[PDB]
Write a protein that binds this ligand. Structure first.
Ligand SMILES: [K+]
Ligand SMILES: [Mg+2]
Ligand SMILES: [Mg+2]
Ligand SMILES: [Mg+2]
Ligand SMILES: [Mg+2]
Ligand SMILES: [Mg+2]
Ligand SMILES: [Mg+2]
Ligand SMILES: [Mg+2]
Ligand SMILES: [Mg+2]
Ligand SMILES: [Mg+2]
Ligand SMILES: [Mg+2]
Ligand SMILES: [Mg+2]
Ligand SMILES: [Mg+2]
Ligand SMILES: [Mg+2]
Ligand SMILES: [Zn+2]
Lengths: 127, 97, 63, 25, 212
RNA sequence: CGCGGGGUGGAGCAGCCCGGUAGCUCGUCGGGCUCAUAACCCGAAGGUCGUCGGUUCAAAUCCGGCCCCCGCAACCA
RNA sequence: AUGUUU
RNA sequence: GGUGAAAUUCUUGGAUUUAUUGAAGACUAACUACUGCGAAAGCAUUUGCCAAGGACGUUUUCAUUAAUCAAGAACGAAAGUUAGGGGAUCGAAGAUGAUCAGAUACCGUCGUAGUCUUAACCAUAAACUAUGCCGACUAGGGAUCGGGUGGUGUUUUUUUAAUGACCCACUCGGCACCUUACGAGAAAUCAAAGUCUUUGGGUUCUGGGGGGAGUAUGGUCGCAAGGCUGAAACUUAAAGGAAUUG
RNA sequence: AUUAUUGCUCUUCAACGAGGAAUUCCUAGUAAGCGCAAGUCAUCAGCUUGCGUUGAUUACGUCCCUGCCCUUUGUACACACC
């Protein structure tokens, strides 16, 4: 009764990407970022920016013709954070509320088996 | 003098424990010394469980939970208030609050 | 526009970042055997009647 | 002075002494 | 000024031959052209599907499946099984402190030509009357149990194709077999087949591939 | 000598490719928060588009010359 | 974010 | 992209982001604990091989064969050195961006040596439990690890019984832990830092106010960096330890 | 009495179309509007001190903002962070 895409929320610190693609993932649809919807150089990760980007992506999705999305959310992962950014929740807010249907919330944050010795040195960032 | 009865870590009979990196500042930490907190916060609460369940195409969806073990150096743990400076007698209290 | 009226029966406590809202135990008039936790900004005491548009949204603590 | 940096400065001084004594024969 | 979605066509993926349902969804791609055929741009696309969506029952919410398109028959993407892995949420809900995790792995070739790497997972459990609050193994029980799991896994595979392997993993009969074969060594509650991965593909062999 | 590019507030740029009409980043000035600067918020000053002619319902924008800077290419008084 | 000495 | 904010920088040669693969090196998450082994440094993916190890059990054997140990030897984190290989990430140096009054730092980006391995050095750490080893005794208690003993035990079945896991009772050895301390200490605290002016179980090492100084010199080891041994002149009334009040 | 002390009369009638970031006071006869008495005085109120008249709104709480108090904590400070 519906047609399935993939939400591909990439909510890092300093930015949140909303990337809705086909079920395969090779073909992209309306890849929108928070920096596209705010120009301050510090609010790209803000919940308002993420919400506006997700609303635009949902409008473009409902103009292409995709109705429901399996949601794959991730942080930077790798070696840096492992923690989803503040804007992912707002982006999913907008995706759910803009008429798109939501399915299979999933965390695809990349987690290593103690690889890629972390950036910052053994004494870390000294602020 | 000696501030803590054993040490500011948990190591008796080992000598060396392989190190870990602070999640917040990336400082190298002994694994037993690092403040370890398991975050089992749900993937999407966002005051939005109702919205997500309504937009869900899955009945009784039972949205999943994200697990993440955070390791802090004591400086970052104090600064972000995972741990707090306790009284001299209250330091001898290992039960969680 | 869905309509439903209820009444506060147990005042829970003061809540809010600035401490403006009050948590209230909401007893419905229709199908009364249900108590709902909700948030109200204005002054409230017991046996006061409230109007809520949404029917199922449990207001949790405001942090 | 940190004792570490005092030791490092002393080591540099000792290296200079070794160089000058190597020159002087 | 271009709107690349105006020249794209949709395809319905009739992915499984055996799970419960042929149809899993739709996918869009640019129209075939002179030096770039639509079937040529396809045949490599893989879809990521939920086993609960495949079987109709929510008791398969984890064990997501990869399926790669192998041929196009009139806007119908015929795939074949490509791999299964647990979700991160499920994996982190199974892994807990105050218990011993045991992971085992094999590399085995199925009956006809199919090469798979299999990852089995399990965790220790507490007894009904146990007072001790960790219930750890003695690591010799762990070595023996993982030997047994590898033996059972290599005995189940190499006599089954992907089709029969799916017909055994979906009812999780292998998990119960591991539980029954290791219940005399350690209780080992949380038996699962955490992952199956494709390593090498054989000749296309459409004759056996078209089983539906 | 030929073909192309460039000149826009005090400095750097979009605007031009088919007129609603000069702005953006930094510095400069004023007020605001702070115990005080910085970051920041709100205001204020700034050229009239390199210089001329021409075309144009009203041209920096398109056209034809000149001054400057640039790349390539050619040289029988 | 920074605010030097007596 | 990155930051508190920026900027260096990549970017209509399609950068960031998505998907399918491959190559490289490093590492072994989550399980991971007041838990284990090792003489220490250290040791955490599977399997095989290779030898070794402590505890336990013993109505087995030897019978003083033992304890600590100058000189003397083996190993010895990281960093560094030599010659090959490898070089992903991080990253002393170096180069750049911003703040600063200056910022040759903290913060951001790139990035050499190094980070990995083989064969040789190096022999140094807050190499710490800042607590030598062996032996005996002096409170109580509960967990935990490995082993052994018993149960009208619970659970697992194969078919009596039995190992497996579990509970209880111990017992030996171990990492520790909590209370109380006769006792000790200046106190913090300590089951050893107790059995010390009522001072002797055995034995090795180190120290004699703070600087100069772990320096100079001599010797010795090292390719080097340096390691070991190691003063004196001179100078000073305090330095220092614990705890208390502001 | 000029650099009008002040009072009064006539006469061109200027900005201001409700206010920017910010910022001050305040919980019931209170804020606000209003004038009166006194003080400063030979004279001069927009000032201040007291007063009365008209007299609301919202709240009956909180530690997010600021400041302060207490407790804990660190100190190599004790003339005590000048
Ligand atoms: K390198
Ligand atoms: Mg700091
Ligand atoms: Mg201290
Ligand atoms: Mg050590
Ligand atoms: Mg002074
Ligand atoms: Mg263990
Ligand atoms: Mg592992
Ligand atoms: Mg010796
Ligand atoms: Mg080394
Ligand atoms: Mg600084
Ligand atoms: Mg030493
Ligand atoms: Mg002395
Ligand atoms: Mg002291
Ligand atoms: Mg006055
Ligand atoms: Zn940290």
């Amino acid at each position: 009764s519906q047609v399935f895409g993939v939400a591909r929320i990439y909510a890092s610190f300093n930015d949140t990407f909303v990337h809705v693609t086909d079920l395969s993932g090779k073909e992209t649809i309306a890849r929108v970022t928070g920096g596209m919807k705010v120009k301050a150089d510090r609010d790209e990760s803000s919940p308002y920016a993420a919400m506006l980007a997700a609303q635009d992506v949902a409008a473009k999705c409902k103009e292409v013709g995709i109705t429901a999305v399996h949601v794959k959310i991730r942080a930077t992962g790798g070696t840096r954070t492992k923690t989803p950014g503040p804007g992912g929740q707002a982006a999913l807010r907008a995706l759910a509320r803009s008429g798109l249907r939501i399915g299979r919330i999933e965390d695809v944050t990349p987690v290593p088996s103690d690889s890629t010795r972390k950036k910052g040195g053994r004494r870390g960032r000294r602020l | 003098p000696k501030k803590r009865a054993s040490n500011g870590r948990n190591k008796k009979g080992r000598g060396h424990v392989k190190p870990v990196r602070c999640v917040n500042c990336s400082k190298s930490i002994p694994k037993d010394k690092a403040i370890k907190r398991m975050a089992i916060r749900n993937i999407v609460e966002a005051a939005a469980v109702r919205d997500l369940s309504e937009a869900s195409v899955y009945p009784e969806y039972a949205l999943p939970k994200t697990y993440n073990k955070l390791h802090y150096c004591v400086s970052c743990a104090i600064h972000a208030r995972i741990v707090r400076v306790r009284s001299r007698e209250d330091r001898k209290n290992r039960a969680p609050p | 526009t869905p309509v439903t009226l209820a009444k506060v029966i147990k005042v829970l406590g003061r809540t809010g970042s600035r401490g403006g809202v009050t948590q209230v135990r909401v007893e419905f008039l229709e199908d009364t055997s249900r108590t709902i936790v909700r948030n109200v900004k204005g002054p409230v005491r017991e046996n006061d009647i409230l109007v809520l548009m949404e029917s199922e949204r449990e207001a949790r603590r405001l942090r | 002075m940190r004792a570490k940096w005092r030791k490092k400065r002393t080591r540099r001084l000792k290296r200079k002494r070794r160089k000058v004594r190597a020159r002087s024969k | 000024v271009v709107d690349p979605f105006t020249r794209k066509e949709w395809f319905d993926i009739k992915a499984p031959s055996t799970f419960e349902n042929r149809n899993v969804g739709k996918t869009l791609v640019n129209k075939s052209t002179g030096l770039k055929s639509a079937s040529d741009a396809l045949k490599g696309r893989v879809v990521e599907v939920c086993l609960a969506d495949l079987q109709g029952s929510e008791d398969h919410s984890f064990r997501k499946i990869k399926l790669r398109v192998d041929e196009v028959q009139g806007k119908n993407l015929l795939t074949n099984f490509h791999g299964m892995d647990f979700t991160t949420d499920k994996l982190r809900s199974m892994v807990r402190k105050w218990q011993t995790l045991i992971e085992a792995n094999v590399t085995v070739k199925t009956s006809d030509d199919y090469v798979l790497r299999i990852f089995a997972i399990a965790f220790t459990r507490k007894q009904a009357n146990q007072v001790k609050r960790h219930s750890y193994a003695q690591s010799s029980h762990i070595r023996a149990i993982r030997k047994v799991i590898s033996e059972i896994l290599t005995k189940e595979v190499q006599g089954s194709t992907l089709a029969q392997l799916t017909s055994k993993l979906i009812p999780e009969v292998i998990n119960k077999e591991i539980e029954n074969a290791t219940k005399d060594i350690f209780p080992l509650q949380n038996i699962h087949v955490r992952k199956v991965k494709l390593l090498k593909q054989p000749k296309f062999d459409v004759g056996a591939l078209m089983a539906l």
